[PDB]
Design a protein around this ligand. Structure first.
Ligand SMILES: *[C@@H]1O[C@H](CO[C@@H]2O[C@@H](C)[C@@H](O)[C@@H](O)[C@@H]2O)[C@@H](O[C@@H]2O[C@H](CO)[C@@H](O)[C@H](O)[C@H]2NC(C)=O)[C@H](O)[C@H]1NC(C)=O
Length: 288
């Protein structure tokens, strides 16, 4: 709902005479860019009722559980799903169950079925003859999507995670002798994305787009994609998500006008340099 699945255990786990029960939140994902949010009541948030609650993994959502043999074992979510977005904060609080909630946004493309788990377990809290419930989240991600319209600035000079970086975007750009600037061509309804270089220093994509018509007029006032294309969405626009130097964009179906835009990227260079180099990135929308 609203591209967000919520598992809210706030009112699911309190001790009752018939507890413990198992409260299972089943999240099934088969479409792009879904945000998953999990709320787990904190010990002490109500006087007695969560006194022995525990959440697993402690480092959720960075670390998740998967089922191996018959056991739940900890794995890094970013290794399970390339391009997944974990932001450091949720409403300006650490993205960690010690603040009561975690969130992450799944990417435009998932190649293989992936199933992982979180636990929010109040079944060891007792009060008189009551016991709390055991909360479990099962996230089942089905394969979905196809390559992302956009560009992957790849770390090698020429042509297990390196394989994903090379199959995820429609245009690959290698470090050495690049003769093809990134050109992301989108139409109404499309998802786009750029994996920015590992040694990126800064970029004006996509907060400072410059419109142009055939020839570049360097003086033209810049504007964000969100302000140029009403109801567009940019993901990880802060580029503060862990692991992946990526941004995604979505162009709404409502948007049927044509734009030609550019932004640019600066790399980390030897401090010996007097002159810095900005490399242009081209974005077109509904190019006729
Ligand atoms: C920018 O878009 C908003 C919201 O867009 C609407 O919802 C989308 C899902 C899509 O279906 C669009 O066709 C819609 O316009 C516009 O604001 C709204 O205007 C509509 C009139 O059609 C009205 O019914 C809504 O209640 C309004 N909602 C809000 C939050 O204002 C807004 O006018 C657009 N801005 C420009 C400059 O075009």
């Amino acid at each position: 709902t609203n591209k967000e699945y919520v598992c809210d255990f706030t009112d699911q786990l309190k001790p009752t005479e018939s507890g413990p029960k198992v409260k299972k939140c089943e999240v099934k994902v088969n479409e792009p860019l879904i945000k998953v949010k999990i709320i787990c009541p904190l010990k002490g948030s109500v006087e007695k009722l969560y006194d022995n609650i525990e959440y697993v993994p402690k480092k959720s959502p960075y670390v998740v559980l998967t089922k191996e043999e018959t056991k739940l074992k900890e794995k890094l979510l970013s290794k399970l799903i390339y391009g997944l977005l974990i932001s450091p904060t949720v409403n300006e609080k650490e993205n960690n169950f010690k603040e009561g909630v975690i969130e992450f946004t799944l990417p435009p493309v998932v190649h293989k079925a992936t199933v992982f788990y979180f636990i929010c377990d109040n079944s060891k809290t007792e009060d008189d003859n009551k016991k709390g419930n055991r909360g479990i989240v099962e996230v089942y991600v089905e394969p979905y999507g196809n390559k992302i319209n956009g560009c992957a600035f790849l770390d090698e000079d020429e042509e297990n995670e390196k394989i994903k970086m090379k199959t995820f975007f429609t245009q690959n750009i290698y470090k050495k002798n690049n003769i093809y600037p990134c050109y992301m061509k989108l139409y109404s309804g499309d998802i786009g994305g750029i994996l920015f270089p590992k040694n990126i220093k800064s970029t004006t994509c996509f907060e400072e787009m410059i419109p142009y018509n055939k020839e570049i007029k360097w003086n033209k006032e810049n504007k964000s994609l969100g302000n140029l294309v009403n109801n567009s969405v940019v993901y990880n626009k802060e580029m503060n998500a862990k692991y992946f130097n990526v941004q995604y964009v979505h162009i709404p179906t409502s948007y049927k006008d044509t734009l030609n835009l550019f932004c640019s990227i600066i790399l980390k260079e030897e401090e010996s340099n007097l002159i810095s180099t900005s490399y242009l990135v081209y974005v077109s929308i509904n190019e006729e």
